[PDB]
Amino acid sequence: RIVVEGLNSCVWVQHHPDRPSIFSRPIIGRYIAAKDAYRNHAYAAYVQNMSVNRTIEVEVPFYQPGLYGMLNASDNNTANSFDRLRFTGLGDLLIGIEGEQPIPKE
Amino acid sequence: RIVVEGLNSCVWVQHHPDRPSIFSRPIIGRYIAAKDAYRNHAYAAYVQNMSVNRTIEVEVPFYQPGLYGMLNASDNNTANSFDRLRFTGLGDLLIGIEGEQPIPKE
Amino acid sequence: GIEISVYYSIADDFSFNIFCGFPPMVYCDETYSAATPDL
Amino acid sequence: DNPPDPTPAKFFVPIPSHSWAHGTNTSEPTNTLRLDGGVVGVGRSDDIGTSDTAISGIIGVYGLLKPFDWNANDTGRNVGGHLLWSMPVHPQVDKDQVIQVMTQSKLTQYYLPPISVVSSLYAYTRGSIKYKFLFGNNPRHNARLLVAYIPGISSDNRLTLERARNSAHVVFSLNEVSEFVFTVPYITDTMWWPRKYGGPQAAGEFVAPSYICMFILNPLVAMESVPSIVTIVPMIAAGDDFEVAVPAQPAVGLSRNIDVIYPKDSIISFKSGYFPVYVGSWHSFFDSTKAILRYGAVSDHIAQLGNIPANVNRKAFWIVVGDTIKFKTKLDKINGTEWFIPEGEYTLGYGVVWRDGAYAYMVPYPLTPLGEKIAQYTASLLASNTAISQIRPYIPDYIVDSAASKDNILWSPIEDR
Amino acid sequence: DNPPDPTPAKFFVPIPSHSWAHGTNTSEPTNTLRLDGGVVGVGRSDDIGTSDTAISGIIGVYGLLKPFDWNANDTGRNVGGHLLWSMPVHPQVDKDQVIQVMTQSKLTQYYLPPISVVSSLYAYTRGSIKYKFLFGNNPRHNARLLVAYIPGISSDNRLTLERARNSAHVVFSLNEVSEFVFTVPYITDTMWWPRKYGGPQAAGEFVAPSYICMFILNPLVAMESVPSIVTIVPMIAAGDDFEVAVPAQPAVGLSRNIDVIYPKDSIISFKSGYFPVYVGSWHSFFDSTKAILRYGAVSDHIAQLGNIPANVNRKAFWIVVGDTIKFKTKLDKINGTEWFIPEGEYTLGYGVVWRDGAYAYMVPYPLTPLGEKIAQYTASLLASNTAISQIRPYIPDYIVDSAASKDNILWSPIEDR
Amino acid sequence: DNPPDPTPAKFFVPIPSHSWAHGTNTSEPTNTLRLDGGVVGVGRSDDIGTSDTAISGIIGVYGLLKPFDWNANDTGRNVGGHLLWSMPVHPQVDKDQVIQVMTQSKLTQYYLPPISVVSSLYAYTRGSIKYKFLFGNNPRHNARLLVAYIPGISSDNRLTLERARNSAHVVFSLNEVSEFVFTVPYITDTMWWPRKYGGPQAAGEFVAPSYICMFILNPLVAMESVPSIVTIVPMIAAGDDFEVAVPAQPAVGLSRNIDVIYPKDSIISFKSGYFPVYVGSWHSFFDSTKAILRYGAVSDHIAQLGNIPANVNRKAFWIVVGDTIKFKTKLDKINGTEWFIPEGEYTLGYGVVWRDGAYAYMVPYPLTPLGEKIAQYTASLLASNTAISQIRPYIPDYIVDSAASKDNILWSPIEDR
Amino acid sequence: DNPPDPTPAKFFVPIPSHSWAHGTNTSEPTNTLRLDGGVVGVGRSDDIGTSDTAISGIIGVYGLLKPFDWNANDTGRNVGGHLLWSMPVHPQVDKDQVIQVMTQSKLTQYYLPPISVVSSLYAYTRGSIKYKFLFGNNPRHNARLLVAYIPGISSDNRLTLERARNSAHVVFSLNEVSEFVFTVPYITDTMWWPRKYGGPQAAGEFVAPSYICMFILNPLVAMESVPSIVTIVPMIAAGDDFEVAVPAQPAVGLSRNIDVIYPKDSIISFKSGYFPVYVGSWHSFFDSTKAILRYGAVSDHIAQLGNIPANVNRKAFWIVVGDTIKFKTKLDKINGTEWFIPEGEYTLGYGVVWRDGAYAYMVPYPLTPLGEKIAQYTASLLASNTAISQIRPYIPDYIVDSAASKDNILWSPIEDR
């Protein structure tokens, strides 16, 4: 459930099941690589105008090639990078803005 | 699905099945000829206030005189202008504004 | 500022259970008098 | 497959909330703060009864009213035809027939019976009322009483035994009997009767429809080896035919907090230099035998009141808000009433405005339920331009100058029935 | 009882209005301005028919087309093999085959048949067309005609009787017969055929798929006691197999208001000091035998046009917008056509731009349907750099200088098929 | 056909989201990010079990508690009636009965059993608890223990064997037996019992209802060819009758990140010029035999604390936040307790404020679980104005001046049960 | 009649649009732009097939892979045990095993087979793959090949015939046979296998699970009256057991527009005054036998690169973006590879950065698929600090100074597997 306050523009949300992060911390704004910073095609998505509702409700599916996904995984993992890369997280969720409206100083 | 952000006015949408473009690029604003720049009568249309919803949902029908419509058609086509003109595109979709509200500087 | 107004009521599963006495009361007509009928 | 759904949209009207008034015979959508998202309700057992909020079971419980003494040796009062006790009949009891607790600068606490409390929650009322009378006697005492229900009468101004017998009434014998109930009728020209006490500034108030009166048929007799006084304790409950119509602003509030802020716009006081004040006498007012507030011992030095707003009712008396004083006064019994003030030290709680030309003076009254009544009656007499000589017996007497006030004294306008 | 309703809220999408396009096979929620809040509809009886908007019943009604004379004494035209009448076949009739009314500075009014009016409301069309031919004859007249339907041909450029007989055709005998119908086929390489006339700036326009032509098999014969001219009135209706596909911008508008505001950006005129203008001659233009617009009688004083925008099509001729002038001109019949202008006084309605270096001049044309055609053809000849000697017969002749204009004359760009 | 739909619009209430609290017995509308738009759920097989989140199956698993040694040669402790081990009974174990790991400037890590972890997620709890006792013995060792469950007692202040036998208890024989379980009862004056540990600032915390105690009936015996120490490892699990009522703020957090930012407003330190500090002695404090923090070697040079806010509880001791120091101290065993600090080098982790007039001084304590207890007890003794001579045995001894700090030392207020 | 409707309003949640992700197994409300307001769909017949988008029918169609020649007269290569052809097995083919078209400053066009195109639309894949091998032979040619599927191997670094025979393999005889199919297995440690090529900046990319290799068992034989070269054309299709799991960003784009704007922030060039540049030699770099970019003919005048950002991978080589130059170079065949550049004039497309202290120089490479590989390999050798003498054979030779550039040359960072 994404709650966005202070923005009068439109919000887009994508799910990248084949691209999950190997770190347990989010990446913000201008630090996001181009491959993710912009809307990708063909991914399951939802686009919502804040004018109608400021709360987004989505369900993210399990799209992993294996039997299980690992719980409580370490970010320091070099001996099993493959496990940490594709058998741990559901895939990154990206939340972006779609409009020309400026962001308030707050 | 037309998503219009930044405008507080009303949006009108028309479908011109008998007038499809022979180019694979859109035409914007003051470059649109009068025949299309203004609302035409009797065409299937939908008029939506942005105050109620900033997303427009329409389905454009197939109104072509032939058996098939051509996929992947060339813009450089003089030997078969007729095919390119009326047996290729579903007809232009025009998106306009209906109100006196000024457009923000963004 | 912002104003927050909380209204409340009894739910459907609620019960006022053991009847003891009422306590002594005050009268609302003894707050603002009718000596000034409009005020 | 992705079939289109061109079913026409419906017109709907958005509203921010569900019903605020409905309390029965309807569902209420809401967001329950639970883990279980169904229709959930707290568990129960015999350890926990069902709600005991059924009205009839509440208002059926007797409540106590102001008791009174019945003296067999009173050769004046203990005679045939004498009115012992009387009041209007309505579910809320008259305020002066209920046990009270007064607090200086605060609100009075009333010990209302269950039928009175519940009735103050509703706008209308109807039905029979059970008046239980409990007597403090033993097998030596004897008397006969006539209690009557007078429809369409609110006071005892024209009430005599020989008239009371011409309405619905009962005759009780006190011969080795200590309790009896007089279930009075409901006689009205309409089906529901509006409550008497309502809201602030007498909002939605009205009057009682009928009167109950207790007369002495055969006077109380005792003997020499037995108490000559018999106390009578009146109690009240709803009859089996009693009903309450319509939810309204409660006529009552709890007594957990008896604080009140009187309107600042109505407050009056003494002009500057005309306070501190004390209770005393001066010659031009009944030859200095009555009490008034002075600001000094030189004469014609009678405390003057500040500007009195014109929106204040002419028949209104006043109540002290801030600090006050104590003073010794008295009042002899007034003809045709049981109104008297024994000689004692009383706090100053009430006042009545005495006008003399462009000057306004204030007359002191004791902070006592009877002082409240005498103050009100006096204000009414000044309102009808009653003879100065006929208002004299309703004014507290002058005994001796009292202590002075710390500073000015503030008064607020009030008015009773 | 006040049970909670924790039923989950549904997701709904708010939209401001119901369908704008739907006109059949659906309900439409709306706020009816009535006292009766149900499904209400105005009352009816036999006095009031049902809606007569069934298309087939409308387009089945014959409409009149431009009539023509058939002269038995014309030893030149009234011969075997001669083409009397011909046009493309499509539901809207060609504009030049329909009765017209022109208005200076306004729009032309066309008397379109029912099949033509209805078809202008829809994008596609198909089916057979009934061409009824009515002859103004009596039992003395006789002839035989061959009318043909030529699929895939839009003009008579390669059309002869001896070719027309090689397509679907009929042979009519005028022997004591005055009416007959030629229900022509629908022969196309596709199922629906796009309408010919569309919207402003030729929006969504196209061409006709086939051609109908009337040839003289056996020439008209009359006698000396009988009219030598037989008028022929063509009429048109939809066949039983006729259909109309898709709602589009009407190709037509009502004639209640024939006003029109031509785009200001396209308007051209004469440079300052080069007006008022008049129609005259000068030597360097076909030895001053043809008409041009001059601004004075000194020579090389030929009115010059202002800046002509580059977005104006090269094959376009012009139409006068504001005030205009009358002028006397003529044009002799051109070889291979029925194109001639009798010597008369005509209003100036059309113009063609004649370029000579950095100077642009304007050639006048009469406000007449034939003048419109000759003007267009001339503009096309200048477009292909046709020999100056071969454009000569398409230019109105000089007779005498005409009146001058009040002031400048304004022109607007137009173009025909 | 286009029939009107005048069906009245319904009143609806717009809300931005569905239930946030509901987790069972309800549907949840949502936008599924899938290609299949129906009710979809990930595939399964025997390779992938069902969710193992059934509480009873989790809290049934035994967790280890703080072990202890049981020395047969201790002629002082290994006697009849001696209390070996005791603690309050509640699902979360007491913090001092659980294996710990402390980190300077960080949070302590506790090895909580499954029944303890799950219980910290819920507000209430009830039922029997299985206390399994594992003994490190072999067939030579023998003893008899009496373990008791004392309802309504939280400490051993009045606890003796000869009293413990007067509550629910069991008697275990260690004769060739190494494991046994004592399933203790649930004896309460109410049905659910509030959890002991809650949230930040002791949010919603309470106390345990009962006590478990292990007494020596027949003392441990060994032989010369056999270990004289028998370790006892207590373990805990939920009984079959155990239940958990109500979701609340977890009393616990993960140990992946044990960082914590103490409130800046509560931080205290030494006044400028009164640091760096070191541990030492001075005469006016128990003849310089106890440890205090000095800022120099001249006497009456005892580090002074800055302003101490009045909102800090009087019974509170302190914990070092930033850099700290190591110091050599000792404390001899205190009468009636197992409280002693062997002579060693310890890091400075805790402090207690010693007030002398307008000056406030700080007493150092070792960063050790026992040092935490002694520091707290001392702060409490200063709170009740206990005799200066009776607080003396609870203060670490002075051995030798220690290293100085790099700079000032920061302290934060804390308080235990 | 106008009955009230006090039915409680329902809670509803407003959202601006319907599902964006759902493409099957659900309805989609929408405003159809039609005249018919029901569930309408375009008409059909046998003239118009049903959608042919069933995946299995698409990926079953064979696509062509990079062909290769098989020379019978090559006494060096045409021997037993020789590796003719090999690559990793995955649905997308390796880029270097697919027909290509390169464009200077634009993107490369790849001729991907149907199984490769479809797979680039989905995230996961699994199943058998049909490798059809077509041979350009006639009845004179003969040989025997051993093709193998090596699970868990991605390269031929440890691959020999005598090892390949120890995995799933087939042995084909070329005796009057021109076509055969090798349906390879799917051998994985998991059920779905992630696609190899993903999105921009190698988004979501991974590696292939297995390897296919073709070995010479019995060498190709021909005769003197017959072609000595036999071409082999590999083709690929999905097996009947092939499946595709999950929609993702297409790994591919159309070739209608092969324009691309490389990030301006990554662009590097030569310092001012160090351009125009040309390809030449200098002594301190392998005795001036290798090609480098110079800015003049005086020595130690080797073009210097501007500031190279630190975020650029150390193993990355470069590609020219703007205008470029042509230059004549060569490279002799490197031991253990089929890597050689014949002596010819090539365009400059790639570069590798050669660092010498605080100065950075650029080494030129030809715009050719093999030049791309050699450039990458060289950059990797510089990355591991390989001996300067061992990188020498991977650098293009110096033949003669080439033309100069018009101005500076711009380079962009790239990196391959």
PDB file of N, CA, C and O in Angstrom, chain E residues 230-263:
ATOM      1  N   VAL E 230     -36.472  17.001 -77.068  1.00  0.00           N
ATOM      2  CA  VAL E 230     -36.983  16.118 -76.030  1.00  0.00           C
ATOM      3  C   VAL E 230     -36.130  16.268 -74.777  1.00  0.00           C
ATOM      4  O   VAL E 230     -34.962  15.911 -74.771  1.00  0.00           O
ATOM      5  N   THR E 231     -36.704  16.801 -73.706  1.00  0.00           N
ATOM      6  CA  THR E 231     -35.941  16.939 -72.472  1.00  0.00           C
ATOM      7  C   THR E 231     -35.814  15.581 -71.777  1.00  0.00           C
ATOM      8  O   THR E 231     -36.733  14.765 -71.820  1.00  0.00           O
ATOM      9  N   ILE E 232     -34.670  15.345 -71.141  1.00  0.00           N
ATOM     10  CA  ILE E 232     -34.456  14.123 -70.372  1.00  0.00           C
ATOM     11  C   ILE E 232     -34.176  14.483 -68.918  1.00  0.00           C
ATOM     12  O   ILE E 232     -33.241  15.228 -68.632  1.00  0.00           O
ATOM     13  N   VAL E 233     -34.986  13.958 -68.004  1.00  0.00           N
ATOM     14  CA  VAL E 233     -34.808  14.224 -66.578  1.00  0.00           C
ATOM     15  C   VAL E 233     -34.355  12.974 -65.833  1.00  0.00           C
ATOM     16  O   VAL E 233     -35.153  12.076 -65.576  1.00  0.00           O
ATOM     17  N   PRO E 234     -33.068  12.921 -65.466  1.00  0.00           N
ATOM     18  CA  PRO E 234     -32.523  11.805 -64.691  1.00  0.00           C
ATOM     19  C   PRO E 234     -32.884  11.888 -63.212  1.00  0.00           C
ATOM     20  O   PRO E 234     -32.845  12.974 -62.631  1.00  0.00           O
ATOM     21  N   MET E 235     -33.239  10.753 -62.618  1.00  0.00           N
ATOM     22  CA  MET E 235     -33.555  10.688 -61.198  1.00  0.00           C
ATOM     23  C   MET E 235     -32.817   9.521 -60.556  1.00  0.00           C
ATOM     24  O   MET E 235     -32.423   8.577 -61.241  1.00  0.00           O
ATOM     25  N   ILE E 236     -32.639   9.579 -59.243  1.00  0.00           N
ATOM     26  CA  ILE E 236     -31.809   8.593 -58.562  1.00  0.00           C
ATOM     27  C   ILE E 236     -32.403   8.135 -57.232  1.00  0.00           C
ATOM     28  O   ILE E 236     -32.939   8.932 -56.462  1.00  0.00           O
ATOM     29  N   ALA E 237     -32.321   6.830 -56.988  1.00  0.00           N
ATOM     30  CA  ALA E 237     -32.763   6.240 -55.732  1.00  0.00           C
ATOM     31  C   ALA E 237     -31.907   5.027 -55.402  1.00  0.00           C
ATOM     32  O   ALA E 237     -31.192   4.506 -56.259  1.00  0.00           O
ATOM     33  N   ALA E 238     -31.984   4.578 -54.156  1.00  0.00           N
ATOM     34  CA  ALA E 238     -31.220   3.415 -53.740  1.00  0.00           C
ATOM     35  C   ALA E 238     -31.929   2.138 -54.160  1.00  0.00           C
ATOM     36  O   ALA E 238     -33.155   2.048 -54.105  1.00  0.00           O
ATOM     37  N   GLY E 239     -31.149   1.147 -54.575  1.00  0.00           N
ATOM     38  CA  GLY E 239     -31.693  -0.160 -54.878  1.00  0.00           C
ATOM     39  C   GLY E 239     -32.087  -0.858 -53.596  1.00  0.00           C
ATOM     40  O   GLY E 239     -31.790  -0.374 -52.502  1.00  0.00           O
ATOM     41  N   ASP E 240     -32.770  -1.989 -53.721  1.00  0.00           N
ATOM     42  CA  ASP E 240     -33.227  -2.728 -52.552  1.00  0.00           C
ATOM     43  C   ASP E 240     -32.048  -3.304 -51.766  1.00  0.00           C
ATOM     44  O   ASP E 240     -32.186  -3.674 -50.601  1.00  0.00           O
ATOM     45  N   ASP E 241     -30.883  -3.351 -52.408  1.00  0.00           N
ATOM     46  CA  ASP E 241     -29.680  -3.944 -51.826  1.00  0.00           C
ATOM     47  C   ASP E 241     -28.704  -2.906 -51.278  1.00  0.00           C
ATOM     48  O   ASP E 241     -27.525  -3.203 -51.081  1.00  0.00           O
ATOM     49  N   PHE E 242     -29.191  -1.694 -51.045  1.00  0.00           N
ATOM     50  CA  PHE E 242     -28.327  -0.586 -50.643  1.00  0.00           C
ATOM     51  C   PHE E 242     -28.157  -0.468 -49.127  1.00  0.00           C
ATOM     52  O   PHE E 242     -29.118  -0.633 -48.376  1.00  0.00           O
ATOM     53  N   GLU E 243     -26.936  -0.165 -48.686  1.00  0.00           N
ATOM     54  CA  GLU E 243     -26.615  -0.087 -47.260  1.00  0.00           C
ATOM     55  C   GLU E 243     -25.615   1.031 -46.960  1.00  0.00           C
ATOM     56  O   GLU E 243     -24.851   1.447 -47.833  1.00  0.00           O
ATOM     57  N   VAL E 244     -25.619   1.514 -45.722  1.00  0.00           N
ATOM     58  CA  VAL E 244     -24.731   2.602 -45.308  1.00  0.00           C
ATOM     59  C   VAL E 244     -24.012   2.233 -44.011  1.00  0.00           C
ATOM     60  O   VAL E 244     -24.656   1.978 -42.995  1.00  0.00           O
ATOM     61  N   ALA E 245     -22.683   2.184 -44.048  1.00  0.00           N
ATOM     62  CA  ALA E 245     -21.900   1.737 -42.884  1.00  0.00           C
ATOM     63  C   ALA E 245     -21.673   2.654 -41.677  1.00  0.00           C
ATOM     64  O   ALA E 245     -22.112   2.319 -40.598  1.00  0.00           O
ATOM     65  N   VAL E 246     -21.019   3.800 -41.806  1.00  0.00           N
ATOM     66  CA  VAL E 246     -20.406   4.357 -40.578  1.00  0.00           C
ATOM     67  C   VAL E 246     -20.515   5.865 -40.381  1.00  0.00           C
ATOM     68  O   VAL E 246     -20.002   6.640 -41.185  1.00  0.00           O
ATOM     69  N   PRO E 247     -21.161   6.280 -39.276  1.00  0.00           N
ATOM     70  CA  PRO E 247     -21.412   7.686 -38.947  1.00  0.00           C
ATOM     71  C   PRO E 247     -20.133   8.509 -38.946  1.00  0.00           C
ATOM     72  O   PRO E 247     -19.153   8.156 -38.289  1.00  0.00           O
ATOM     73  N   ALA E 248     -20.160   9.613 -39.680  1.00  0.00           N
ATOM     74  CA  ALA E 248     -19.028  10.514 -39.773  1.00  0.00           C
ATOM     75  C   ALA E 248     -19.531  11.942 -39.852  1.00  0.00           C
ATOM     76  O   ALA E 248     -20.738  12.172 -39.947  1.00  0.00           O
ATOM     77  N   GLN E 249     -18.603  12.893 -39.796  1.00  0.00           N
ATOM     78  CA  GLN E 249     -18.927  14.299 -39.988  1.00  0.00           C
ATOM     79  C   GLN E 249     -19.741  14.473 -41.260  1.00  0.00           C
ATOM     80  O   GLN E 249     -19.302  14.074 -42.338  1.00  0.00           O
ATOM     81  N   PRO E 250     -20.951  15.034 -41.124  1.00  0.00           N
ATOM     82  CA  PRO E 250     -21.812  15.264 -42.285  1.00  0.00           C
ATOM     83  C   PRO E 250     -21.066  16.015 -43.378  1.00  0.00           C
ATOM     84  O   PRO E 250     -20.374  16.992 -43.088  1.00  0.00           O
ATOM     85  N   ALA E 251     -21.205  15.560 -44.618  1.00  0.00           N
ATOM     86  CA  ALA E 251     -20.573  16.239 -45.738  1.00  0.00           C
ATOM     87  C   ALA E 251     -21.341  17.499 -46.083  1.00  0.00           C
ATOM     88  O   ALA E 251     -20.897  18.312 -46.892  1.00  0.00           O
ATOM     89  N   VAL E 252     -22.490  17.662 -45.441  1.00  0.00           N
ATOM     90  CA  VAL E 252     -23.415  18.723 -45.793  1.00  0.00           C
ATOM     91  C   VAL E 252     -23.850  19.543 -44.586  1.00  0.00           C
ATOM     92  O   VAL E 252     -23.677  19.133 -43.439  1.00  0.00           O
ATOM     93  N   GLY E 253     -24.414  20.710 -44.867  1.00  0.00           N
ATOM     94  CA  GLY E 253     -25.006  21.549 -43.845  1.00  0.00           C
ATOM     95  C   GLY E 253     -26.295  22.109 -44.401  1.00  0.00           C
ATOM     96  O   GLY E 253     -26.517  22.074 -45.613  1.00  0.00           O
ATOM     97  N   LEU E 254     -27.152  22.619 -43.522  1.00  0.00           N
ATOM     98  CA  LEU E 254     -28.424  23.185 -43.953  1.00  0.00           C
ATOM     99  C   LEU E 254     -28.206  24.469 -44.751  1.00  0.00           C
ATOM    100  O   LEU E 254     -27.119  25.043 -44.739  1.00  0.00           O
ATOM    101  N   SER E 255     -29.246  24.922 -45.441  1.00  0.00           N
ATOM    102  CA  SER E 255     -29.141  26.138 -46.235  1.00  0.00           C
ATOM    103  C   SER E 255     -29.898  27.299 -45.607  1.00  0.00           C
ATOM    104  O   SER E 255     -30.148  28.311 -46.261  1.00  0.00           O
ATOM    105  N   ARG E 256     -30.265  27.145 -44.337  1.00  0.00           N
ATOM    106  CA  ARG E 256     -30.928  28.210 -43.592  1.00  0.00           C
ATOM    107  C   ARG E 256     -29.993  29.404 -43.441  1.00  0.00           C
ATOM    108  O   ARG E 256     -30.418  30.558 -43.466  1.00  0.00           O
ATOM    109  N   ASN E 257     -28.709  29.105 -43.281  1.00  0.00           N
ATOM    110  CA  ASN E 257     -27.678  30.127 -43.179  1.00  0.00           C
ATOM    111  C   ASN E 257     -26.500  29.736 -44.060  1.00  0.00           C
ATOM    112  O   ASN E 257     -25.725  28.843 -43.711  1.00  0.00           O
ATOM    113  N   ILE E 258     -26.370  30.402 -45.202  1.00  0.00           N
ATOM    114  CA  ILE E 258     -25.327  30.062 -46.161  1.00  0.00           C
ATOM    115  C   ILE E 258     -24.112  30.975 -46.036  1.00  0.00           C
ATOM    116  O   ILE E 258     -23.286  31.044 -46.945  1.00  0.00           O
ATOM    117  N   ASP E 259     -24.013  31.679 -44.911  1.00  0.00           N
ATOM    118  CA  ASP E 259     -22.854  32.521 -44.635  1.00  0.00           C
ATOM    119  C   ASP E 259     -21.617  31.672 -44.362  1.00  0.00           C
ATOM    120  O   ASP E 259     -21.723  30.561 -43.849  1.00  0.00           O
ATOM    121  N   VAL E 260     -20.447  32.200 -44.703  1.00  0.00           N
ATOM    122  CA  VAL E 260     -19.191  31.509 -44.431  1.00  0.00           C
ATOM    123  C   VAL E 260     -18.046  32.510 -44.271  1.00  0.00           C
ATOM    124  O   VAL E 260     -17.971  33.502 -44.997  1.00  0.00           O
ATOM    125  N   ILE E 261     -17.173  32.264 -43.301  1.00  0.00           N
ATOM    126  CA  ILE E 261     -16.008  33.117 -43.093  1.00  0.00           C
ATOM    127  C   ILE E 261     -14.738  32.399 -43.543  1.00  0.00           C
ATOM    128  O   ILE E 261     -14.213  31.531 -42.838  1.00  0.00           O
ATOM    129  N   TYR E 262     -14.267  32.753 -44.734  1.00  0.00           N
ATOM    130  CA  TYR E 262     -13.046  32.182 -45.292  1.00  0.00           C
ATOM    131  C   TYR E 262     -11.853  32.581 -44.429  1.00  0.00           C
ATOM    132  O   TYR E 262     -11.861  33.654 -43.824  1.00  0.00           O
ATOM    133  N   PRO E 263     -10.826  31.724 -44.368  1.00  0.00           N
ATOM    134  CA  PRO E 263      -9.669  32.017 -43.516  1.00  0.00           C
ATOM    135  C   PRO E 263      -8.928  33.288 -43.938  1.00  0.00           C
ATOM    136  O   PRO E 263      -8.548  33.430 -45.100  1.00  0.00           O
TER     137      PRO E 263
END
